[PDB]
Design a protein around this nucleic acid. Sequence first.
RNA 1: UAUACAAUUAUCAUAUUAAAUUGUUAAGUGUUGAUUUAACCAAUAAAAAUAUAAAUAAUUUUUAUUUGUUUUUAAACACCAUUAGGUA
RNA 2: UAAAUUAUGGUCAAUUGUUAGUAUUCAUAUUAAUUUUUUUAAAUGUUUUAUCAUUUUAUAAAGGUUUAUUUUUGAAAGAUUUUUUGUAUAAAAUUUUAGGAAUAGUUAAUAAUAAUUUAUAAUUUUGAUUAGAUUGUUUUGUUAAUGCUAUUAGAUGGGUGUGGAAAAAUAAAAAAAA
Lengths: 256, 222, 361, 42, 141, 122, 55, 110, 106
Amino acid sequence: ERGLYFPINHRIVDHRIAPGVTVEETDVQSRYRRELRTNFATGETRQTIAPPWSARERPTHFFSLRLPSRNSVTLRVKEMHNHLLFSHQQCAPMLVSPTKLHITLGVMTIPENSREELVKNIQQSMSETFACVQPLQLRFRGLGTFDFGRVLFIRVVPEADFGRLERAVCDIRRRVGGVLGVDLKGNPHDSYVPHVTVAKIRPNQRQQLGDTIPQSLWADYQHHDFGDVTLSTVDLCRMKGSPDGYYHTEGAVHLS
Amino acid sequence: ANHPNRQSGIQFLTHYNTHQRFRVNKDYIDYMHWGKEQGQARLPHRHQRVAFDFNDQLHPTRIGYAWFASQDPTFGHHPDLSSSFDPNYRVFSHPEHWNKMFTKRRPGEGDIDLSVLPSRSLLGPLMAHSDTKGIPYFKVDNRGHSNGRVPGVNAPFFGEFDQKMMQAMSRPLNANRTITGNDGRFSKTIMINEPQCNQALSAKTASELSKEIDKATNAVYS
Amino acid sequence: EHPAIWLWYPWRMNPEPPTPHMPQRRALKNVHGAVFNDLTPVQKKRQEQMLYGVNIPETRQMKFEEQHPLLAGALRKLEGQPKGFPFWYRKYPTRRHAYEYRFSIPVEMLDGYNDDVKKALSKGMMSIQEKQFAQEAMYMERYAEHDFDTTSPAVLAVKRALKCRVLRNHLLTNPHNNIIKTVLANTERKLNHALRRLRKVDFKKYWEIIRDHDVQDILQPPNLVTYRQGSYWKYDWNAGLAISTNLADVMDPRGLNGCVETGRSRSEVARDLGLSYTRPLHENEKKQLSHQAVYYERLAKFKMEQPEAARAMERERFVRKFSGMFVKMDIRSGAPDFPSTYRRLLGTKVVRWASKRHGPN
Amino acid sequence: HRSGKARAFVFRDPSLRMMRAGSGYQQLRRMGMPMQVGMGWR
Amino acid sequence: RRREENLYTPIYDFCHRIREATEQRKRFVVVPSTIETRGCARVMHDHGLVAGFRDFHNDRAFAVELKYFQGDSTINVIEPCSYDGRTEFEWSPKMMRRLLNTHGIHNRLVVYICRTADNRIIDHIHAVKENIGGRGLMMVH
Amino acid sequence: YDLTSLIFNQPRQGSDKIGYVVGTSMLKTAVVATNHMVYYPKFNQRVSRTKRFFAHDEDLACVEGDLVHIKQCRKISKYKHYYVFSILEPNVEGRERLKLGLKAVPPPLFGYPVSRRIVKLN
Amino acid sequence: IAHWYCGHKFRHRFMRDKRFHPSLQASHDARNRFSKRRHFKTNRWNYQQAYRDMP
Amino acid sequence: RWAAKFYGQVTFGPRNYPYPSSRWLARRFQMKKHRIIKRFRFRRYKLAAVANLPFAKMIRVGMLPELKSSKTKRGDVVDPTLSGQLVSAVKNTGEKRKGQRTRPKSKYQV
Amino acid sequence: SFKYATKLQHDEMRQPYYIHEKRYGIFSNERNIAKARRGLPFITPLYTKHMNLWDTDTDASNNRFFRGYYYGQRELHQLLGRPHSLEATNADGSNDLSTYEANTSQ
RNA sequence: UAUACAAUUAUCAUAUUAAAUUGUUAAGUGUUGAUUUAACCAAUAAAAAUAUAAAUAAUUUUUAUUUGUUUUUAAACACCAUUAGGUA
RNA sequence: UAAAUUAUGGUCAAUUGUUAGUAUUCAUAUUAAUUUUUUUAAAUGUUUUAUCAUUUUAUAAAGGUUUAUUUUUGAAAGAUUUUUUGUAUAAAAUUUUAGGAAUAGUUAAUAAUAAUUUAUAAUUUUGAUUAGAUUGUUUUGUUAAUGCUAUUAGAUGGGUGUGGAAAAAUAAAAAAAA
Ligand SMILES: [Mg+2]
Ligand SMILES: [Mg+2]
Ligand SMILES: [Mg+2]
Ligand SMILES: [Mg+2]
Ligand SMILES: [Mg+2]
Ligand SMILES: [Mg+2]
Ligand SMILES: [Mg+2]
Ligand SMILES: [Mg+2]
Ligand SMILES: [Mg+2]
Ligand SMILES: [Mg+2]
Ligand SMILES: [Mg+2]
């Protein structure tokens, strides 16, 4: 009586059920708008997906833009942690320490034998790619999820110097994965989605934490604005958490 | 049109932004003091006319004789070369420039702008008189005549004067615009136009002329 | 006491003046009908800063020294000595460029003369009109793309902004000259044009002009009617700046376009490339979305922890589906706009709706 | 007659009257412009 | 100057310049210079309705030389096809073919000028020849 | 025959429209003002009329004063049959205006006309 | 002109046709064609401070 | 101005008649205008237009029960508060207060 | 041009039927004829327009209705940023190419 | 009852590219009385002078702004009433 | 910025009032109509069937609607031993009154939610909603002609919801299972 007789959002045909079934044999009931609920609402993001053989092996090193000291980002993420922990303190193991915040430009697997040839060669190619690029001012607002809501990150908006990043990345992508064959978890002809990972659930953690980060935590910060940052520093990092208190850094390039 | 302020009529042959002369807000005319030389006071002044009569002279080309050296030594000043000619020249009109409407029209009254008539006061030439010679001596100006090299004005003038416009509008009889023509009812004018090479005809241009000449000559009405 | 009353004795040409009497001095409107009682503190600051004097920025001396280091070298040898050759001519390309002394007399030309003369050509001796022209020339110079630029949008916008302020404070003093009311309104209109062309040429300069001279009041869309029809945004179509953006420096174009063969929108290809374009949200949209995101968690918790309440509500819904107006979906029932497609029922048979149109169509 | 219809000074060239009629409703019906949404003639 | 007024076209006042300059028996007219205007002039000069014409590559205007015979002009009437720019008349080949026919006798007496899709300014006679339709400009005779 | 059919090949009339975004007060909904054409055969001339549409932008990109491409689609809500297909011209000034916390566009000074005289002073 | 439409005079017909004329149609410049005068001087005494959120 | 300049069409002469009106016609219409105006004066007409009300519809105050001239005809129905205020307006319009601007007075205004 | 050509009841004055096939496919109407509510008043709209006038397919070069200046083409040129005028060099409304069209091979 | 305005010039009420706005000057007492008016009546009589240049042309002011009604007579003329006053 | 010819081609545009100084489509004309005349309609009982039942037989009652009316094959056609499919309900244009103001079970998001979910909502002066008149987008008359001037009729809510589809309560002129 307060709206349409048949609300338009409720008109749904399921074509993944056989024809004739719903007319005679039985009726099928489901809450159908959990599935139809879109990629903007859920906060999912489609990352470059790995081929199965690459999907098998752990990633070892990654490219990163290092966040400078005195960031808008780091500050606001600290504020966000405060708020989240005051709401639910079950988040505490999920959250990444503000010390480890960095922009992830791509991920890669390096085998341990060819290690030095690869790090030297990579470092060199990287330095050539970024030779001409001056520092990058990028904008961060919004949250998103990788790997079925297990990884919770801060989006990099394509409103700014981001454009340049995309060419820049796509060049190293075509060198590191194209030229010297290296395992980039995706195709070298495809571009990686840059992100700042905030909360994460590792395999070991998953038992006590659960299989997905409940959206009730970060729902309100989903579109929150973390601000602008200029970035001069590119790293190639191996992931060791006890060597310096920051991800162990195998290579570096200065944008100037 | 019997309405006052509509008397100036419909003239299209003016240069203004309306074909209706009486909506034009630029030049308000003066019916009492105007039209000695132009006939009616409605019509455009001698120097602003965009349409020309058969036996009347058209506008003088402004100079701003040295360049006639090739011509008849006796030939004097060509009638159409003038030192001072202004297509934009404000003619004094009382209702515009001297406007008595807001007054009782007593002898001194009415508002006057002096920007129209050139000042006949001695104040100007006294106040500006300098030991440095004038603009012409100093040659401050760039450019020159706006059309560049002009046979009458800047450069010298060779050949013949066309005082009627007869050669100036003719139709090229050729794809190359080498040969041009002017046809009256019973007469035909074929004019060779190659001023650059001194009227020296090429093989193509000559073989063309022998066509235009006999097609003009074997015409019915010539 | 309560509404004004016009009294009209119909044999008379016009009514008698109203009883509350109105304000004795008529309000001064801007072009759009908005009221200004006085200059805003910013504009006031602009005129107070024009009045006592202007100055040439040492910016010009600097670029003069870097561009033509020889001439500046000469003037640097000759300071205080009378000069017979004007080496400084490159510093002042135009007549208008020299405002620091009257009659466009450059500073270093006064070197060899009397100090009395120096005081007689000073700023303090300018007329008010001259002072306006001074402020205008200074600002025109700071926003100009080259020396002789006039007609370009930034310049135009600035000079019209200044003219507008002048006329405004003028009208503040002597109330009725409606000639200048009209000239102020026309100037304001041409300013509106100039600014709206600016924001599509270069927007930061547009911003800083609005912030310097405090004209945001003439950028406000006049009335809701013509705005709702999108004729406010239709202006920069007519100006030819609508496509002028040159995206690639801003807004990576990959997620602004839809797929022709696929049919998927721009939000879809943005989804697929893992990009997010989203306008910054106010608190409305944020708290709506953050309220909606959580529906299923709230629901799961409800039907786990409290099954009886749920089953009650469900009883009501399920049984409702059998009661009510229409039990099945047909063209009649499934008409998205019921009152619209059947208007012929609205007075007599169908009493639910009192009007045939609740939306655009 | 200030209150009444405007009259032409002379006639109108009939040929021009026929030239300005090219896009008129009849020619359009012949071109097929209007959609046929109803039964029309029987 | 206002809304109700017609929207003038270089063709409109080209025709009226020529008409008025013909009524005052002038030898030369200075007239607006656009593509279809000097097109119209070349066509009129073809048919001999005009003594001559020239474009000086002056931007605004060019000049036409009028022809008189037996004391009155060679032009009875000259009229533009449209009063506005907001109205555009299209001439079917059959229409332009009707003009040519006076109750069974072939009549080229009156000339009609028109644009083509090919940007040519043509009389109706060549148009009918190649069976192309065109947009109307003016009639003259 | 107008601009819209000039640029597009439409499967069905009105399947494509180009317009400006006027207002976003509704989540995932952009209102769009669009022009179309009417012909008067008596006077042989065209007029442009204008019409508003509700378009569905998932993900909320459209800022008031965007030039957008719009398409016909599935019935979405009571009044939305159109979705935003592409942003032709975004509003850069408006977006930066939002980023600073201000409204995209200043709110119109006067509303709809009235037949009364409102005396409201100070 | 059929005499039953609009007023009893003829010119009433052409006065309502001017309402449909193509070049006379309502737009962003020409507005309120049918009642201009009911809306005249309506906001004179309505004092509205203009909208500035930028300095 | 509110009231009508003319009554009926006062400029009817042939086209290009080089005056707005002829003497004859203008005299006829001057007669009709005269009669109407005289009617307004003697019947003591009063109109009002109030703020925040539809303006085209003017309350006729000369027909109000207090200010009504006739002893017979039923006058009009206007709100009690509003009508009190109208009566006060009409009353305090009458006489010149010093410092106020002098406004034309008549017998028929009362 | 006469009254007899006003009567479209002749088949010689009327765009033929088959056009509606050529647009929507052959034998497409046999579907529509069996529809529930038909011909009271309305039938599924029958599109017959001479194929050289089709708005869908054709453009400014082969169709005279597109090259009408003052409403379609004026807007288009304002948008694309070409210089334009009433009587222009190009068939449609435009004196010259825009900057983009001059600097880019398409 | 149906059955073809003008568009080159048309006088009553739907304006629109415009340079204005602001100026502290003058005038007044000797003496015994028919001035003004076609004619009446009241009853000191003298007076208020200065500004050009400059403002750029067009494209979204039509709910905005605008077309000889105006504080102060303890200052007159003038006008209206008639010696009482009104207005200026 | 040059003419053109291998010559009438690509199939018909053609206006008829005897007025009364002059200005302005206005009495008396022709064509088309109503005035005007029983040579085209028609009467009731639909029909099978397995028996108190069940199969076949789907748009002429009225009301007055101008952002308005939109849809499938599961019936029949229909072919064949049994299962078989997908496409549909949505829109865009065109919309009347001489003197013109506000409208409302109400928008959008959520969802098989909410007689109190969330929100800075929706329609309107580019003319709304009520209210008058009116049966909407191949049909006529006049005319040399852009015009002017006609076109009927037929879809009027729900309440054990049958049926493929509500079109389901006299009023055919549709052969309805030998
Ligand atoms: Mg609807
Ligand atoms: Mg009703
Ligand atoms: Mg009087
Ligand atoms: Mg007809
Ligand atoms: Mg008027
Ligand atoms: Mg006074
Ligand atoms: Mg029925
Ligand atoms: Mg109704
Ligand atoms: Mg519709
Ligand atoms: Mg619909
Ligand atoms: Mg019932």
